[PDB]
Amino acid sequence: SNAMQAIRSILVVIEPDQLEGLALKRAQLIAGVTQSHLHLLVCEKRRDHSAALNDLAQELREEGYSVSTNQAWKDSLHQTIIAEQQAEGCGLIIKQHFPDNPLKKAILTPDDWKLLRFAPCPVLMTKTARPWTGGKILAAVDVGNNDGEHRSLHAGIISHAYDIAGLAKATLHVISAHPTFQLSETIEARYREACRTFQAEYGFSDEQLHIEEGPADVLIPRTAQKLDAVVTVIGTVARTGLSGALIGNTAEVVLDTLESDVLVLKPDDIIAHLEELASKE
Ligand SMILES: [Cl-]
Ligand SMILES: [Cl-]
Ligand SMILES: [Cl-]
Numbered sequence: 001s002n003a004m005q006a007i008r009s010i011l012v013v014i015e016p017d018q019l020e021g022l023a024l025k026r027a028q029l030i031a032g033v034t035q036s037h038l039h040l041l042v043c044e045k046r047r048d049h050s051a052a053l054n055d056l057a058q059e060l061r062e063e064g065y066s067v068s069t070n071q072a073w074k075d076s077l078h079q080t081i082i083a084e085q086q087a088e089g090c091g092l093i094i095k096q097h098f099p100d101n102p103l104k105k106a107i108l109t110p111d112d113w114k115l116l117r118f119a120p121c122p123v124l125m126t127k128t129a130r131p132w133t134g135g136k137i138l139a140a141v142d143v144g145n146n147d148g149e150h151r152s153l154h155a156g157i158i159s160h161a162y163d164i165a166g167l168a169k170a171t172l173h174v175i176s177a178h179p180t181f182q183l184s185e186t187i188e189a190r191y192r193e194a195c196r197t198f199q200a201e202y203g204f205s206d207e208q209l210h211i212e213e214g215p216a217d218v219l220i221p222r223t224a225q226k227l228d229a230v231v232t233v234i235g236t237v238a239r240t241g242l243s244g245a246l247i248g249n250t251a252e253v254v255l256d257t258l259e260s261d262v263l264v265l266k267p268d269d270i271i272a273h274l275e276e277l278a279s280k281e
Pocket of ligand 3: 117244245246247248
C-alpha cells in the first residue's frame with residue numbers, strides 16, 4: 001500500500017518542443033505527497049538547454065521540491081533515459097507518450113517500446129492530459145493465478161495502484177480477466193471461492209472488483225474505457241517468452257490501446273536481470 005511513497009527519486013523525461021508537459025505534472029503531484037526527489041532529464045545533443053533547465057529547477061525548488069537536472073545523449077532516446085536512471089538511481093521513470101501517427105494515437109512509438117522492454121524499474125507512460133486528482137485508478141490482475149510469481153506481481157500492482165489512489169484522492173478499481181457441464185460448474189465454483197479469498201485479502205468491495213471472462217487484452221481496455229480510468233496499473237508477463245519477449249501479448253496490446261496513463265511493473269526477477277543488463281553499459 002506504500003509502493004509509491006517508497007520511491008525516493010523519480011526520473012522525469014522532459015521534452016523540449018511539445019505543447020504539453022504531463023510528465024512533470026504527474027511528477028509534481030506524486031512528489032507533492034511523497035516528497036520524492038525529481039531528476040529532470042532532457043535527451044538531446046544539439047541545443048544547450050542548461051539555462052532553461054536551471055530556470056525550471058529554480059521554480060520547482062521554490063515550490064518546495066527537491067530537484068536536479070541534466071541534459072544528455074548517447075545512442076538513442078531510450079538508452080539515454082535508462083543510462084540516466086542508472087546514474088541517478090531513480091525508482092520510477094515518467095515519460096509522456098507522443099504518438100508518431102495522428103491516425104493511430106494510442107500506439108506507442110518503437111523507441112518507447114524499447115524503453116518499456118529494458119527499463120529496470122517501473123515506468124509511467126502518460127497518455128492523457130486529464131488530472132489524476134479525483135479520478136479512477138484501475139489495477140489489472142489475474143485472480144485465477146496465485147502462484148508465487150503472480151502473487152508477488154499482483155501485490156506490487158495493487159500496492160502502487162492503491163498508493164496512487166491515495167495521493168490523488170481518487171478511487172481504486174480492479175479488473176481480473178480469466179479465459180462436462182457438471183465438472184465445469186465445479187471448477188468455476190472453486191475459482192469463485194478463490195476470488196472471494198482475494199477479495200478478503202485485499203479488502204475489495206463487489207463494486208470495486210470486476211471479474212470478467214474473456215481475453216485480458218480486450219477486457220482490460222474495456223474496463224478502463226467504461227470507468228474512464230485515468231491511470232491503469234499493469235504487470236508484464238511473469239515468465240519471458242521466446243527470444244526475449246518479456247512484455248507479453250496482453251501488456252503489448254493493452255499499452256497500445258489504453259487512453260489512460262499506464263504504470264508498467266515487471267516481476268522482481270525480471271527487474272533484477274534488467275538491472276544487470278543496464279549496468280553492463
Ligand atoms: Cl527509489
Ligand atoms: Cl495530475
Ligand atoms: Cl518484449
